[PDB]
Design a protein around this ligand. Sequence first.
Ligand SMILES: Nc1ncnc2c1ncn2[C@@H]1O[C@H](COP(=O)(O)OP(=O)(O)OP(=O)(O)O)[C@@H](O)[C@H]1O
Ligand SMILES: Nc1ncnc2c1ncn2[C@@H]1O[C@H](COP(=O)(O)OP(=O)(O)OP(=O)(O)O)[C@@H](O)[C@H]1O
Ligand SMILES: Nc1ncnc2c1ncn2[C@@H]1O[C@H](COP(=O)(O)OP(=O)(O)O)[C@@H](O)[C@H]1O
Lengths: 309, 760, 68, 68
Amino acid sequence: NTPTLDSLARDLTVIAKDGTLDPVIGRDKEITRVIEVLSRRTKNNPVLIGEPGVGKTAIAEGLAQAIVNNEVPETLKDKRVMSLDMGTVGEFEERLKKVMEEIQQAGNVILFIDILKPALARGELQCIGATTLDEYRKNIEKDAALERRFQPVQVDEPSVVDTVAILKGLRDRYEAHHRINISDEAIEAAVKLSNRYVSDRFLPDKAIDLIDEASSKVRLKSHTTPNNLKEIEQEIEKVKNEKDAAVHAQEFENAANLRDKQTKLEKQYEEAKNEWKNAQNGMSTSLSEEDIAEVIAGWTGIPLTKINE
Amino acid sequence: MLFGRLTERAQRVLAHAQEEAIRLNHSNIGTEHLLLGLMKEPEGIAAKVLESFNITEDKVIEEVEKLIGHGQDHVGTLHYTPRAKKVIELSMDEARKLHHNFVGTEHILLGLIRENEGVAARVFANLDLNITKARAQVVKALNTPTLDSLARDLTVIAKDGTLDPVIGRDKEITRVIEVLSRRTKNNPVLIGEPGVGKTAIAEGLAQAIVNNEVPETLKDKRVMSLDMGTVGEFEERLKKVMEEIQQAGNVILFIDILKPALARGELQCIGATTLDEYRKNIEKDAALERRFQPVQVDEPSVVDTVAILKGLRDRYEAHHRINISDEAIEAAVKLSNRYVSDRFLPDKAIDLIDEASSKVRLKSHTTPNNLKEIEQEIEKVKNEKDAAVHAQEFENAANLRDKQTKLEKQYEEAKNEWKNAQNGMSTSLSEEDIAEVIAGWTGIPLTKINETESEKLLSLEDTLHERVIGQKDAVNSISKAVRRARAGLKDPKRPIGSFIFLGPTGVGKTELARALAESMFGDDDAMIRVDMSEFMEKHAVSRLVGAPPGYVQLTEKVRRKPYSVILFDEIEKAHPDVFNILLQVLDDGHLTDTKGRTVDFRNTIIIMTSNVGAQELQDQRFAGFGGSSDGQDYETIRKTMLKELKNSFRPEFLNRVDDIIVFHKLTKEELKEIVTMMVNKLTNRLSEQNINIIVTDKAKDKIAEEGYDPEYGARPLIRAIQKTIEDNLSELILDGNQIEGKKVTVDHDGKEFKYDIAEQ
Amino acid sequence: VIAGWTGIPLTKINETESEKLLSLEDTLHERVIGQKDAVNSISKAVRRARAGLKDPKRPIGSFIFLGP
Amino acid sequence: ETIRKTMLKELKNSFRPEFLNRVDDIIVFHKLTKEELKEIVTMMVNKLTNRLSEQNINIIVTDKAKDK
Ligand SMILES: Nc1ncnc2c1ncn2[C@@H]1O[C@H](COP(=O)(O)OP(=O)(O)OP(=O)(O)O)[C@@H](O)[C@H]1O
Ligand SMILES: Nc1ncnc2c1ncn2[C@@H]1O[C@H](COP(=O)(O)OP(=O)(O)OP(=O)(O)O)[C@@H](O)[C@H]1O
Ligand SMILES: Nc1ncnc2c1ncn2[C@@H]1O[C@H](COP(=O)(O)OP(=O)(O)O)[C@@H](O)[C@H]1O
């Protein structure tokens, strides 16, 4: 069960087994690419070539997701996924010698990195690199032993259409708290303008940025009371505090009227609240395209009139 | 909560004091009016208090009448004195002690007796009635458990009214609630510099519950605050608090793991992180980028800051019992930002007005050399009495006891009459008190700060002529152009001035530049000198503006002193990319560093010194025999140099210059008065030694031509004076104070400089 | 007493602080023979600062030596 | 003073303009002549003998040896 690897790193099959995180949507193309490289006899160490932030983290997350879903092939069946973070880096070399021994004996441990030359030369460790392109051509290419052992994988930003399916797939997972209705028009409109203005962090992280504070002026805006409960609740507040003072002051001449008034106001508050929600829960507050572009107006400073065309 | 909790009896006291001022011919309502008004309302619980203490209405009227004076007053404008306002502040504390939530006539007496400084307090003391006696009289005459333990509730504290109410956030607070109108996209982030006051935003949300101004969603909504001062098991307690928020539906998180929680939307968390650490973690995460957006929450403007302190006026003018005027608050913020503008706003004004109000309180709460001379005699008599009792001399001790009692009787009468006039008047906050305090923070003399900004501009030319003699064309050209933007005729966004120094080097461009800051900012050293000699490569452009993120000057320095003069040397020798940055300064009037902070240059003067066209000016001087081009009009000289200037630069760049300044040449007669000025300046530094130095015209003419050179200018003049006047002057200084307190005369006989020592 | 805290001889401590700068050129030439053109330049430039002519905040001297 | 003027122009070629303005006085040195070197060796003889004061040994060097 590789106890050393389970304590010095983070296991991915345990996290994916519960499925408490959002599923990886839109990276289905890379799912078949990672397993394909691991099945090759030569160069069975794929490397996530790309800028840091393009979505390389989701590539490793989706690899262990197929194990629970029984979508991985027989060659990659029932194999745990282990990732070693760079923040736990002499005595440093004394720990990596024991971890590699357990991987060879088990035969189902897949390393994930973000000394080891003899280990990679024999292909004993099937580590998956995650270094950027700039650092891959400076430390890995300069060494001939690792040149024929690490197979670069082109992991770049997805297409515009591919990002659209991400929002639709996760839409059902975004409505479970207040049961609101989201229009389908805002889904396609959240990817056209995303690349127009924000083009400095690549897809899909820069793509899903328009729907953060775009259309939020409809649903709860009508849930307010137009000078209805602003005064009813205030009357209840003053009666309660004044009632307690009259008890200790031996003044029950006016306290008797206060109790009846307070009870009547409490009944009225419940009736007013019930009628408010009954006439509003039936209607649905869907999104509108006229307010989607309002959030991007303040990100860059472009006037809303110029954007709304 | 001023009049909301007032009952029928409490409000009657307010009207009674109003009418009593007219009959008593008092223009203000002090403690003498409130005490009498309470005695005329025997309906509250306190009615039995005065009856049980043998206190009637007719006795207190005459007792308080003698203490107060009588005289002419002003009809109307009968407002409350700040000293009498202390009753309202203290009455809230008394209710919290007994866990009560009502205000009535039973707290007025407690407030007037807990001050020990008003007229009403002295009446109680004279009637053998103190706080302790009335303390027991009133007594007998009368849920998210996890969230509350791991955080603090704001609506509970704000319900009592102990924290200072948020005043001046009439737009930032309303901006947050307007966006808070849906289950999703309802997580605003407070983005601003550290010190702008983003903590009070959370308090304002809970304040609407107390005032019943909150909507139905925010009605009776517990505003929870998660402070950063309470920081495996890390991600364990936070997963239980979030469960209580969803079920209760009235808990608001205030931060200063949670990504799946905001994926759907259920917590109306409002961030408070600074801009320098908000785009580095929230933006890089896709999940956190679906709920949080930066919001423009910066320091308030000059006018906005004044309104902030107006709401908090009652929290300070009554605590210190010092009257705060409207003119004092507006002048405090304007002067503070002029000199000390490092701590931002409005936090730097709270402490400034606190010390200003405390300082005047200290000066108006002392003994005017009347009770001191009496108290010292009482103490001396007490020591004398001890010297008699221990000596077993009671024959002389009998007189000591009688004298001690007599002195104490006079002490109480003198103390009461001293404060009889003090209580009838209120100590306002004069504008001079704020000026004195702010002057001690920067060392600026009080005279410089105390200016109406009306005569300084008029006498701008005279001040400049004191340090620079000659070239009146350049002095008047800059003086007329600088005041165009000050009066508001020019575009407010554009800087005040964008003058360009042109001409031969060494003529005195630096000397005139420093005089501009002296006559405007009142500081000779308020000037930042940036040299373009080190700015040659293309990569040097990312130095003065700031290091771009991912790798690791002028912007940092200018931010500390925005009211300075930015001077550049050898601007003609610089990278072409540098000129693009300079154009933006003179067009929009502000810049932005790599950290997202927007610096301001509206108060900065940009001067670019270039050596181009110097060869043309010197040729015109010797172009005509028997004279020079000095007699030509200044406009003609400007036009000739304008064509040469645009040849090496871009035509559009020169369009942004308010006025092109071309310096003249130094003649023999001009240098004569330059030497005279330096002697006078040295005499000023010798005022401590009280030594007068007089230089004859013969010496001035001889020394002027010693280092005369058209290419150098006035630079060799300093060297000549040091090796001629200062050499012999220093020798006589170290001779046993030989020339101390005397008069030294410098005369040139033709070859040497004979020094004559005479009396002063 | 102050001599035993820094090791300075009693003769050096007991000085008027005026004759030392008057005979500065003679004392300097005891250890420096020749280059009198620079001895006089620095001797006349230090007495002015001690005379109070120079600004007190600035240092006493800012000489820049040049040559082989 | 003429030597100072010539050196000053080249000094500011590689230096900042205002850097030399704060200097109270620029000092320029010279070379060493044969006559000056004779007294330099003499000073070292006196210093060496002074360090041997506890030895109570007198050292005298002829002018012929100093020149050699
Ligand atoms: N009209 C004047 N009256 C009195 N002093 C003057 C006048 N014009 C120039 N000076 C003196 O000339 C001196 C010149 O030295 P400074 O370091 O200011 O250089 P500058 O000539 O302005 O040249 P640069 O711009 O190259 O630094 C100043 O210190 C100033 O006292
Ligand atoms: N004016 C002088 N008269 C006599 N001896 C001198 C004089 N100037 C220098 N010397 C001698 O020069 C010798 C060398 O001194 P030092 O080792 O300090 O180097 P330096 O010549 O000043 O050069 P550097 O600046 O390169 O260190 C000293 O032992 C000193 O006796
Ligand atoms: N607009 C305002 N109205 C009232 N009080 C304010 C305001 N802004 C700041 N304050 C007060 O200034 C104090 C200092 O706040 P500060 O520490 O600067 O907040 P932050 O650290 O979020 O900038 C707070 O206690 C707050 O009560």
